[PDB]
């Protein structure tokens, strides 16, 4: 049958507006900026933004719009030999659909802890804390082996952090039930219902941004926030000599745009043909980058206040890892009037952003995997069993990283499984196939037929030159100057855990050469005939 189309021009805007404006902006860009020194992260961030990420965002939206198929089968008319890029995207989003939702579990664990009249991270006289904990207000009053209540609540109550990935500890029942609650919300809000329609247009679209503006106003007026903004903006140029900044910023663009996932292609698949995706895509990419930049201003003003209050330097005041949004932002919540109310509203904001940017990516995965097998998964009894099986398998695989040694597995997934050199591999192969095996001229002619105009010399030369050169250069540079993944600057990962992370990255990567080999083996003839048959669009 006819698949679906957007029953507005605003359903696409609302779908991608909550699609790639999520925790990659308010949670991930903070610690990836903080981990790489603040100012030095913004140069490759904007290089990959205006050279790669917005062109690949437009690229996948058009590959959805032209080939009205999602993720995998969209390459059936875009050189089917590289159909595995679609498969690669699904592996990426599958791994993303595990680890991303674990964040929301932590947010939900912070949401249930926010209903107390006295916040548990606002003071340390609890059971979970060390005796070395002092209040942040008192660290300039006593005589440097001292720790903050927010970091102690994050590490020994939420995470319950163990000695390493070698010691997973016991499964946290609190966090496992929070993770189960968040998948129950997700599974009840994909297509087990119908569609969130009435409430998504105003509360969803504005209240995360309103709470981000409230957090920005709180952060910028905190004492000592100027040093935090100086950390955030002013670069260390020699830090650009390390490949970590380039790989972190490039795959943070590709993560934050959800753009090697088969999801923006899936949301472009529901676009009408003659629909101007270019202007909407650039306004929404501007929204995404501005949300990241403004939320970074907020959180780094808060970190500058924390460094002012504790006396420790800005680069050491919080976690150089995935808990920076769960350390700095709750600390700013305790600096607001009536902190309980802002705690509930802030973690409702994080939950809303994460659930939107999980409904959208799970929709992309489902859309691609049912365009891959139509009439095996119809619109009825089968795409409830399939949704439940996918959500249950993703929840069970997310139980491995929500345990007591679960931050180490989470940092492994976040560095490797869906936001690393796998993203560079898939983005390079997308831009390479469009540019040279399909043609920027042929694809630009396809673009004009429905958008109305030729893409300029920026998009054409970004798909042609800029994005393959940036992806190849950062992929090569992260391997010829390879430093291993470390969690919070002090935990050295073992060889087997780095191998497991490279296994996740390679399971994402190797869907392209495996599909190339499979389709080269299932077509009869000599090699120059098989390749020519498999690069002709169908």
């Amino acid at each position, epitope marked *: 049958p006819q698949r679906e189309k957007w029953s507005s021009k605003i359903d696409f805007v609302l779908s991608v507006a909550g699609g790639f404006v999520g925790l990659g902006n308010v949670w991930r860009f903070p610690y990836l900026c903080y981990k790489n020194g603040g100012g030095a992260f913004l140069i490759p961030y904007f290089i990959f933004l205006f050279g790669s990420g917005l062109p690949v965002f437009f690229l996948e939206v058009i590959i959805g719009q032209y080939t009205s198929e999602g993720g995998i089968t969209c390459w059936e008319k875009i050189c089917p030999l590289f159909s595995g890029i679609g498969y690669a995207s699904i592996v990426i989003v599958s791994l993303l659909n595990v680890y991303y939702i674990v964040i929301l579990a932590w947010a939900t664990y912070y949401l249930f802890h926010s209903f107390q009249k006295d916040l548990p991270w606002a003071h340390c006289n609890h059971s979970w804390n060390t005796p070395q904990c002092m209040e942040d207000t008192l660290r300039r009053n006593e005589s440097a082996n001292f720790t903050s209540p927010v970091i102690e609540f994050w590490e020994r109550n939420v995470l319950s952090l163990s000695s390493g990935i070698d010691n997973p500890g016991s499964l946290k029942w609190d966090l496992a039930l929070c993770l189960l609650l968040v998948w129950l919300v997700c599974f009840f809000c994909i297509w087990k219902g119908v569609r969130s329609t009435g409430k998504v247009v105003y509360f969803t679209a504005t209240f995360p941004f309103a709470m981000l503006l409230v957090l920005l106003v709180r952060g910028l007026t905190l004492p000592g926030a100027g040093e935090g903004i100086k950390f955030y903006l002013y670069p260390d140029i020699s830090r650009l000599g390390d490949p970590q900044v380039w790989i972190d910023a490039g795959t943070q663009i590709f993560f934050s745009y959800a753009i090697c996932l088969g999801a923006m292609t899936s949301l472009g698949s529901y676009n009408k043909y*003659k629909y101007n995706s270019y202007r909407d895509c650039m306004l929404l990419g501007c929204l995404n980058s501005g949300t990241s930049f403004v939320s970074g201003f907020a959180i780094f003003s808060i970190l500058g206040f924390m460094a002012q209050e504790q006396g420790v330097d800005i680069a050491d005041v919080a976690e150089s890892g995935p808990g920076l949004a769960f350390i700095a932002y709750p600390k700013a919540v305790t600096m607001m009037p009536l902190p309980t109310f802002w705690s509930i509203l802030f973690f409702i904001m994080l939950l809303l952003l994460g659930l939107d940017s999980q409904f959208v990516e799970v929709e992309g995965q489902i859309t691609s995997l049912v365009d891959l097998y139509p009439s095996f998964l119809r619109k009825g009894y089968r795409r409830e069993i399939f949704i439940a099986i996918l959500c249950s398998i993703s929840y069970l695989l997310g139980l491995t990283m929500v345990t007591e040694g679960g931050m180490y597995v989470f940092q492994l997934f976040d560095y490797y499984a869906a936001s690393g050199v796998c993203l560079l591999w898939v983005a390079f192969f997308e831009c390479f196939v469009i540019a040279w095996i399909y043609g920027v*001229n042929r694809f*630009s*002619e396809d673009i*004009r037929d429905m958008i*109305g*105009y030729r893409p300029g010399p920026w998009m054409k030369y970004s798909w042609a030159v800029i994005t393959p050169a940036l992806c190849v250069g950062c992929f090569v540079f992260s391997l010829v100057k390879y430093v291993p993944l470390t969690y919070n600057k002090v935990y050295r990962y073992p060889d087997w855990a780095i191998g497991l992370g490279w296994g996740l990255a390679l399971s994402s990567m190797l869907c392209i050469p495996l599909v190339i080999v499979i389709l080269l083996c299932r077509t009869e003839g000599p090699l120059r005939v098989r390749i020519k048959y498999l690069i002709t669009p169908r």
Partner: antibody
Amino acid sequence: EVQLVESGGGLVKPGGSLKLSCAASGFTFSSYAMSWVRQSPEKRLEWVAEISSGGRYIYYSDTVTGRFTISRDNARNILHLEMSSLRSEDTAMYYCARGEVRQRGFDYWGQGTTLTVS
Amino acid sequence: ENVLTQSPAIMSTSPGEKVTMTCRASSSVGSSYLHWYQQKSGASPKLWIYSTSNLASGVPARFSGSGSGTSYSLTISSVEAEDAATYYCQQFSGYPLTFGSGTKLEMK
């Protein structure tokens, strides 16, 4: 200086055939979609046939949807409109119009060929 | 076809007098795709207004356009002697592309 010069317009019999020729110069012809727009002796403008930049998206109006064929020569920069079974109400002044951006319109027209059917 | 019915062709204005000409569409034109062409007597049409508001190359600022969806309009604040021509509105979105009728701006 974008210049489109049309040629090959004369007198043909009813039910006959003719091949027009929009020779284009002054621009990269492979990157701009083209159209043939005819104008009636009552001086009304009717769009006849659009070809895309590489020639893969070809559109016709409902009058000429089965008897007109528009083609390009991007190597030599000539737009062609091969006609067949020309009826009486196809006598017109044929312009080739450069329309590539759909929001910019036909920003560069050519001269005319006076196709007469008698 | 998306038949564009424009204002009646013969309209006569003294020079320097503000004039409007309207253009209705049977379907809805997206208002970024409707253009206005000026064709003089014995000459080819040329682009005059694109996306129903902008001005082409060499079009004076006295020419303006407005409208949305179905009703669109071209307006001249002051008519000099070089406006004696025919003006065609044209949707250029729906793939059976249609021009409007004549609007012959003659003088007194």
